Design a protein around this ligand. Structure first.
Ligand SMILES: [C][C@]([N])([C][O])C(=O)O=P([O])([O])O[C][C]1O[C](N2[C]=NC3=C2N=[C]N=C3[N])[C]([O])[C]1[O]
Length: 883
């Protein structure tokens, strides 16, 4: 170690100023205060006055003021003690007037006394500055003596050696810079680059207090638990607190201010009112497998942070601001612990029983206070209401109390102690997620091509496909599907093969899909606009043989000779209109769709069929509904346009092929065919509604359902669309291609203005949406995390054939065992249950949050400005081309 210089007392010349202490320096600039309240039957005010008159002397603090020159001197003739008695005994509505309630160091009384007189009862209130003295002083000296002094104001008091002004000049001059000081600034200079920012907890873009009183018996068990791991009553208590926090914490590592109220064991200093406040920056990095392990390890780093106490935290934090940014250093999370200081003479409880007590420490968002009191350990969480999203503190406190409770119930080395983690979600956190994720419904085994075949037999007259003017009935499509599918099986389209379907938008694709499924295979959609090289590339990498195509642009297909190619509009006509029989199963693949290297997606039958018959049972999909099949069949979004409508008698309406979005034709074709179902990415319905508003007719007037998904549903768009056809119910969805087109549905009924984004929603039937930390564990509400869509049948079979990708992105959760897809999107659960979608590794997102109230950063805007934003291949918003 290193011994320190001795304190030089000065019996006199105390009237002359001494500089402000570091903990105090930081409060006298933020001005550019605590409060208590006890009750008791009768307060003898004269006695009380004289007590407080003697309490204003003795301690050189209760008189000190701050000269506006930035220094503090003592006073010696202050005035009389300003006690402000209020009277409300014969006042009815006395609780009401008492209710409305709540300072400068330039002006003597560094506080604010009061005494409100209610009927039969007296309510003593004490303001106080927090620049004036510190927590330990307040409880160990002021209150203690004040009890002594209310009892007998003339009672003997203690001889005040070496007044505080001395300690002040002492640490400032004699102690700073010396042996122990120089030794200790190294530690923090050799860790200042290892310090993790403060707890990053959720916000929601005055002071409230949860507290709990532990009885004496429960105290002592608590302490006993602490020693049995070699910890102190405050050692374990910080450790637990770190755990709770990690739950909602948006990273496991953070830094906890743990101030220490040291006086360097000076003789007589435990009787001086002063600011002995030394912050310590405890680094919380989860070190260990178990609680017992991780709490014991953080306890270690605390003590080591403590043997180096001479360098005040204020400096360390300063130098921290120097190395990094200023704001990127704030320590809003603190743990004030008056355990382990001496047992004072008197306990404020003797005087009167509390009623109110809120520390107003500023720049502190959450203040875990640990103080003992007449036998009990008082735990208290004082938190700045509005620093965090709703409930976040109510929930962590519930979870905290459980954690400590189990520790009161588990013999060390057993139970929670040797538990690898602890689920912080509160009873509601759970109730809401269970209740919103209870999606358990059996899917009837029916081949996706069988369902359609059976509706075609059910309503063969009906309009199945309307494409490029040439319409098609359900029987004529079915008959041409039989034609194709028979032809395929004949050429050996064995069960489980992939028949690549490469064409443009038209009625050829539809029959192509249902003949290929019929033939016992799965269809592999490839865009006819891709480069003449990438097409054959995807086909070769998927190992696909036969390829169906339209005859137009059939020669513009550079494919090999081992891969057969047939036209659909002609190279089929001379076939069997006799139905083929289902050879393939419900768990066999129906389509592979492709998406740093592109990955193919394998999708079953069972899941798509789950989709189809939910969407029908969600929005009452009736055969009257006529749908604008806008998405390209190579985009995952097209799948409801294939199998959705035809599986209960609706009509599919194919628009003329495009490359650039053409909301003109779309408004036309929607206006003309009485289209009632719109399905695309949000920008496409935006462009449509923009073209439609600027028209005299009502073109989009028959629309009864609009499902946007895959991008960001623009905040205004639901109203702007709801503008035309009064009665359209807009709905937004999404979920990755590996999750069967739509997974989570949010009916867009009332865009909230203070929303950064449209809620992602509640899950559909059979899919469960989880929000997990880095450990694939469920998070509690609001918490950021990655999204895990859990599902036996509504999950993608696998990533093409590469098993690495598939077993790495499709995991088993350890909480349950559910096979889940790690979406690679990050979000947070919402206390109605829905999900808020936040981006994908977008944490460095505000942007639109502070934008619409125009794109994101990288910044770009459109109305480095630019005319209008660029799209991607199927629409959305090309955030990758923008830098
Ligand atoms: C499925 C869909 N959504 C359509 O339907 C898609 O998108 O797909 P993809 O892209 O291919 O896959 C994968 C991806 O997805 C994505 N997403 C989706 N959705 C969305 C998203 N993001 C955002 N937002 C929205 N809405 C994801 O991200 C993935 O990974």
């Amino acid at each position: 170690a290193a011994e320190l210089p001795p304190l030089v007392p000065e019996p006199g010349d105390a009237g002359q100023p001494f500089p402000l202490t570091p903990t105090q320096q930081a409060l006298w600039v933020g001005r550019a205060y605590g409060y208590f309240e006890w009750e008791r039957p009768e307060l003898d005010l004269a006695r009380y006055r004289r007590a407080w008159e003697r309490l204003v002397a003795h301690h050189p603090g209760l008189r000190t003021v701050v000269r506006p020159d930035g220094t503090q001197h003592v006073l010696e003739r202050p005035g009389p003690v300003p006690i402000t008695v209020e009277d409300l005994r014969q006042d009815p509505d006395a609780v009401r007037r008492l209710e409305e309630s709540r300072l400068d160091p330039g002006t003597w009384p560094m506080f604010d006394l009061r005494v409100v007189l209610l009927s039969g009862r007296v309510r003593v209130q004490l303001g106080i500055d927090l620049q004036l003295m510190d927590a330990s002083s307040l409880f160990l000296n002021l209150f203690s003596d004040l009890v002594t002094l209310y009892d007998d104001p003339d009672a003997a008091l203690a001889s005040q050696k070496l007044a505080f002004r001395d300690f002040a000049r002492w640490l400032e001059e004699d102690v700073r810079g010396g042996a122990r000081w120089r030794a200790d600034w190294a530690y923090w200079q050799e860790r200042l680059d290892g310090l993790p920012p403060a707890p990053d907890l959720p916000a929601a873009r005055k002071f409230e207090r949860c507290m709990v009183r532990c009885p004496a018996e429960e105290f002592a068990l608590l302490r006993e638990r602490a020693l049995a791991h070699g910890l102190t009553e405050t050692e374990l208590l910080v450790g637990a607190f770190a755990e709770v926090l990690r739950g909602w914490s948006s990273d496991p590592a953070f830094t906890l201010n743990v101030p220490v109220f040291q006086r360097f064991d000076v003789p007589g200093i435990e009787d001086v009112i002063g600011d002995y406040t030394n912050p310590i920056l405890l680094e919380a990095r989860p070190e260990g497998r178990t609680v017992a392990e991780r709490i014991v390890a953080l306890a270690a780093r605390l003590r080591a942070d403590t043997r180096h106490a001479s360098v005040n935290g204020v400096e360390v934090l300063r130098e921290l601001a120097r190395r990094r940014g200023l704001a990127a250093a704030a320590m809003p999370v603190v743990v004030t612990s008056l355990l382990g200081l001496p047992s004072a003479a008197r306990s404020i409880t003797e005087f009167g029983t509390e009623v109110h007590s809120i520390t107003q420490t500023p720049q502190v968002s959450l203040d875990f206070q640990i103080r003992p009191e007449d036998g009990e350990l008082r735990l208290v969480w004082d938190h700045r209401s509005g620093a965090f999203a709703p409930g976040v503190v109510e929930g962590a406190f519930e979870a905290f109390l459980d954690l400590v409770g189990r520790m009161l119930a588990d013999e060390p080395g057993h139970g929670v102690w040797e538990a690898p983690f602890a689920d912080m979600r509160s009873r509601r956190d759970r109730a809401v997620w269970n209740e919103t994720n209870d999606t358990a419904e059996p899917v009837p085994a029916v081949l996706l091509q069988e369902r359609f075949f059976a509706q075609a037999r059910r309503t063969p007259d009906a309009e199945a496909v309307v494409a490029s003017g040439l319409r098609l009935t359900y029987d004529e499509l079915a008959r041409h599907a039989y034609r194709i599918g028979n032809t395929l099986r004949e050429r050996g389209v064995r069960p489980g093969d992939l028949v690549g379907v490469v064409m443009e938008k038209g009625w050829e694709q539809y029959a192509a899909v249902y003949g290929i499924l019929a033939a016992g295979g799965a269809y592999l959609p490839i865009d006819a606009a891709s480069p003449r090289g990438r097409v054959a590339r995807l086909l070769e990498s998927a190992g696909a043989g036969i390829v169906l195509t339209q005859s137009r642009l059939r020669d513009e297909l550079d494919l090999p000779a081992g891969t057969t190619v047939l036209r659909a509009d002609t190279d089929f006509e001379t076939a069997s209109t006799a139905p083929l029989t289902p050879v393939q199963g419900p768990d066999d693949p129906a389509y592979v769709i492709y998406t740093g290297e592109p990955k193919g997606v394998v999708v079953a039958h069972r899941g798509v069929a789950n989709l189809v018959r939910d969407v029908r049972r969600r929005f009452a999909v009736t055969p009257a509904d006529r749908l604008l099949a806008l998405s390209g069949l190579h985009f995952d979004a097209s799948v409801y346009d294939v199998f959705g409508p035809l599986a209960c008698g609706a009509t599919v309406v194919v628009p003329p092929p495009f490359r650039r979005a053409e909301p003109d034709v779309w408004a036309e074709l929607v206006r003309d065919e009485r289209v009632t179902f719109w399905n695309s990415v949000p920008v496409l319905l935006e462009l449509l509604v923009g073209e439609a508003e600027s028209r005299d007719d009502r073109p989009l007037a028959t629309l009864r359902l609009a499902v946007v998904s895959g991008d960001w549903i623009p905040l205004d768009l639901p109203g702007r669309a709801r503008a035309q056809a009064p009665g359209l119910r807009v709905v937004g969805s999404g979920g990755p291609t590996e999750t069967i087109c739509w997974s989570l549905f949010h009916p867009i009924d009332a865009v909230d203005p203070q929303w950064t984004s449209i809620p992602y929603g509640k899950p559909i039937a059979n899919q469960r949406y989880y929000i997990v930390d880095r450990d694939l564990r469920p998070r509690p509400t609001w918490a950021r995390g990655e999204m895990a869509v859990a599902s036996p049948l509504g999950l993608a079979l696998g990533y093409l054939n590469d098993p690495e990708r598939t077993a790495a992105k499709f995991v088993t959760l350890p909480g349950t065992g559910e096979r889940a897809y790690l979406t690679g999107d990050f979000g947070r659960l919402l206390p109605d249950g829905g999900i808020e979608i936040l981006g994908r590794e977008d944490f460095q997102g505000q942007r639109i949050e502070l934008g619409e109230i125009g794109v994101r950063a990288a910044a770009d805007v459109v109305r480095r400005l630019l005319p209008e934003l660029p799209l991607t291949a199927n629409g959305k918003v090309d955030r990758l081309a923008l830098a």
